[PDB]
Ligand binder design. Structure first.
Ligand SMILES: [Zn+2]
Ligand SMILES: [Zn+2]
Lengths: 148, 292, 148, 292, 292, 292
């Protein structure tokens, strides 16, 4: 439903409603052009969102953060209207910043310079652990931190 | 060794070394090498503990260092760590927030020694406990342990369970009320066998080392569940008498009433000796950081 | 930079960066399709944002709230690909919900059922007044409540 | 009349009526019509004031009503208003949050009378003040007023300045320290002349009515600016003597020391009489809501 | 009826009678028989509650009684009961100690009405809840109930489970976290079926009446177990939409946030009406004690 | 040099000397002359500050002195000064009352160093600030300064404005809200040009040194005037970017949020280095008193 991009990144197949959360997860919100469509038809998903970022080729690192909320998403890097890389998303090993620790006595929940960091413990059903206090979080806590 | 934030910072090799240095320093000669001569250690106890403050202070003095420090009391942990880095050559800190020492250690260029962070760890205390055990049995491998009392919110239990992974315990009994059980996260780290149990008289007869932690009222459904349960996680004179001839009872002090005071006269009581190794053990950890 | 809409609303000429704030101001964030472009070229503004809401014709009431942050915006209602109304934005008389009262002792800053309400006092340099406590706010306070 | 939340709820016509009923009720006959017979008024003073509680209580009793109420003390104002609506036929409330009464009045089906909300208004107090003034001079139009003390954070000043817009004051002197000046928002509402001034001895000789409000320490740059200024916004016996033969001094009580106690013996002191009209004036406001 | 200390003081016959009198008193005519004329009821709320104080006060006034009372604040409960016996013809009391009303009722010659004792009971509240239910469905027998939230320490749940034994509920779902479960003692009293469950979405579709109680932070292992669990014992707008067309949601007020405020606009919300029957129901209980 | 109570105790000549000694002591060699060997300095911090306590402590130790002291807590300042005179060879004190150090210095035979008295002065802090400035620009004469934030109640601003009179600043911008302006008394002392201004973006482009002090809520008409003003006396990353290539930002620590933390990564941020000269500067002041 949106025009073709000369240079940059196309993130397709995001669950319907979660494009705004994908932008947050990438730190995006200045300079470059962005387009979104939300709730468009998808032959495999029912509905979906699509994000296009001109002039920025998203790294594999930034892209793997997208799996925390849009594990079905696909990422295409585009040069001169042509797709030059379809990136293979993996679960990230470490997540600094995006996720808070639910333990109010964790140093990361109290000192601004102490940035929250989770290391993935299992990919499988996804469990992640705070590197400061060892509190564990699951896919459900993950998703409701980010989709809020 | 540099930062001492977790019991996992120690290898089995580093621990055997610290034990030997502790033997030497214990045998309290007047020729101890002053490895901290010209150095200032700051003791930053955001959460106070006089027993532990004085213990690191004395270690640092025995080694020839100067001590500065504070105890208690909107300034960022990071800014304080920075300032101590102008003023000193290492930091020993105690804090109420889990992970505080970990975080300081990443801001800081000088070493940082965790003397308690929140409910997470107290690694030097664990080193003292295993030193006492190895001193008594000439080993840690092969022993049968039982931890008694609160095993969920006690940082000394957390540090002892983690440090024991550098060794081969036969078995670690976890004896607590249902409420005060070791957390799942910590049990999945361990590489040795463990078994949960509600009453210590079931297995007291088997255990080489009984390590007790206080249960606090301030931690329960209501005062009635605490009053019903409190009684049977005390080390009573009768529970002491049912232990083997060669076994020891350990407790990281202070105590209130989780140990019958009549026990302090039996040969199995080892918590007094345990507190007494605190200084040489910390001298040794300090020697491994600054003097090698 | 985005496709033509069969039925609904096109909000063009939003200051670059403020499309997300226009959606908040309209209460939008489910069912219907939306598209945005952010930071595209505008011949009169330098840069601009554009929002398209399928299947919803925005009222004059909802549209006048858009002037609080995008006074240059234009609103077109679309039926069957054809523009059937170019709405004339005015400054709203009353604003309930979108704006908070900066007086911490105002009943609206303390009771959840007490919804903040501002009546416009002058359009000209825009000043608005709390109907509960008479605290006055200016275009600057307005804009930094909404663009945050 | 129904809700009494602002001094703007009254017209000039309603006020002249309330004055006549106040005359009648003052002349305290034993045949007052019991317009609240069978009715319950609840007095909901979330922010306490005994003087004002008792004053509405007595008005309500003089008119034959039953009183329920509370004084002081996480439940929503809206839920409380709902409950009082099961229990009663009207509400008199006093609250710490500006706009509280306005909001209650919109939740509520029974009438709501604001007896003080935050620093915003106290309309019945303003009605009492103008009643006292009109009683003395047979008029409010044409008078020259001076308001003295804190004019920024005093809800009685706010209600008096607003109610005076239903009349034609010659002039209202605003006499305060720079810090305690009437807010811009409130001055732009007024439809009569006003002039700001720092010292009352400049114009005391001209004023028909002097209305004073306390300056509080707890409201200043430092205690030294307060101690330097406090002295000259007191009504002293000397400032009283420089006022015209026919003028009056008003204060919505209680007082601490903003009025020299020697003043209470002069004929110009009218604050005692002012507090004494409180009950008949509130009986009249109640009669206009329930008995017409 | 004389003392009302437990929900067990009521028979099924007395309850059907109280419902009929509540119908009559609701239909709020101006000819209610003043059965408490010449009588003084004292309201002795050692543990304060304004909502409930005012509610008994208004009942007592509607029936022609005088009210005396206190609220709050080393004098023996027995001495206070004795004194109220000089001063009054009945007592409504609220106390922090379980069994307090039972004990007062044995010291006292005049009737004693328990308006809350500790965590034990609040019987008049239970009478109000079943009145609301029977009003809606023309029955209590045959209904399927679910109690949601804290079921261990809530005296209203205790009184509702006990009063329901005078009736034939089809089934009572007990939905709580593991920690806040109904005590064994109380479940062995019941003569109707009950089933414990952790999530309400499992059975919401079946229930005629959903009765919710607040979960309090101040009652948990740690703040993290509360934050993890709190979310799913709220009555959300979505949990409301999955209930049957004819079902009702009940809550003995006040509320904080255990009920989404959007729910108050649905036809299933019945907690507002529930608080509104409080006065006629208590008038009826009073009529059964004094006027028959 | 003997007593250090005011920034006026220093001449331009003494300051150039202290700078040279600070260079030498900074370059932290292991041969520093122990001028305080055999001497005891007492640190008497009636008003606590750990940062500053530790800083004088470390200076005194680096010079070979012993430290005694206290921190906090009806005994006369004069009696305490007398006692410290039995116990020690000099005093560093911090007190809540203006003039306290001045007064101690007159009771006392040993030197007295003011480390903060009330809102009056902190002279050693001013010496540290000018040391940092002169280190960066090889001069203090000719610079254009701006002081930002609270300039009325900040003793560091008072000491910096006074010490700058021993030099020739081109111009000192005073940037504060109207409320927090430098007092008249202090401005009449100065012998260099100064200009008052409300917004820093007006002149940021001109300034060599920006020195910021916190604005505190606890100091305002109401919380709304503070919330309206607070935002524009922060050193934001944007205000930093509009300063000249060679300029520096200074702040006598600790900070809360008057400096955007992103600023600490720019080359213009100099507050970290500033706190780091504290010890050598105080060693130098001590050397000028005891070692010459
Ligand atoms: Zn954590
Ligand atoms: Zn307001």
């Amino acid at each position: 439903m949106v025009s073709k991009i000369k240079n940059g990144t196309v993130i397709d197949h995001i669950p319907a409603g979660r494009a705004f959360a994908v932008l947050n997860v990438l730190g995006i919100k200045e300079g470059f052009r962005i387009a979104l469509v939300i709730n468009v038809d998808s032959k495999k998903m029912g509905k979906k969102d699509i994000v296009k970022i001109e002039d920025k080729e998203i790294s594999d690192t930034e892209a793997n953060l997208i799996t925390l909320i849009a594990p079905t998403a696909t990422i295409n890097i585009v040069r001169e209207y042509e797709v030059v890389k379809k990136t293979k998303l993996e679960v990230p090993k470490v997540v600094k910043g995006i996720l808070k620790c639910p333990n109010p006595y964790c140093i990361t929940s109290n000192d601004v310079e102490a940035i929250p960091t989770f290391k993935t413990l299992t990919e499988k059903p996804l469990k992640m652990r705070c590197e400061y206090c060892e509190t564990i979080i699951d896919e459900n806590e993950i998703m409701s931190q980010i989709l809020g | 060794l540099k930062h001492i934030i977790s019991a996992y910072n120690f290898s089995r090799d580093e621990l055997e070394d610290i034990f030997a240095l502790t033997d030497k320093y214990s045998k309290n000669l007047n020729d101890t090498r002053k490895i901290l001569s010209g150095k200032t250690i700051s003791i930053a106890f955001f959460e106070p503990s006089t027993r532990t403050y004085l213990s690191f202070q004395k270690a640092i003095i025995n080694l020839g260092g100067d001590v500065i420090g504070f105890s208690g009391e909107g300034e960022n942990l990071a800014d304080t760590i920075r300032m101590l880095n102008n003023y000193s050559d290492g930091i020993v800190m105690r804090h109420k927030y889990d992970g505080a020492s970990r975080f300081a250690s990443e801001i800081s260029d000088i070493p940082v020694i965790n003397a308690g962070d929140g409910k997470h760890e107290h690694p030097t205390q664990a080193v003292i406990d295993i030193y006492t055990i190895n001193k008594h049995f000439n080993t840690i491998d092969g022993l049968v342990f039982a931890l008694l009392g609160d095993l969920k919110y006690a940082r000394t239990v957390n540090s002892l369970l983690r440090i024991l992974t550098r060794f081969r315990p036969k078995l670690v009994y976890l004896i607590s009320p249902q409420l005060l059980r070791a957390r799942k996260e910590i049990l999945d780290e361990l590489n040795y066998p463990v078994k949960e149990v509600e009453n210590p008289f079931e297995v007291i007869n088997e255990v080489d080392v009984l390590y007790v932690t206080r249960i606090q009222k301030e931690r329960f459904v209501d005062e009635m569940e605490y009053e019903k349960i409190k009684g049977s996680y005390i080390v009573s004179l009768d529970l002491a008498n049912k232990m083997k001839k060669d076994s020891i009872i350990l407790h990281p002090l202070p105590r209130v009433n989780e140990i019958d005071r009549k026990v302090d006269k039996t040969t199995k009581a080892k918590y007094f000796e345990q507190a007494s190794y605190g200084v040489p053990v910390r001298m040794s950890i300090l020697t491994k950081i600054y003097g090698e």
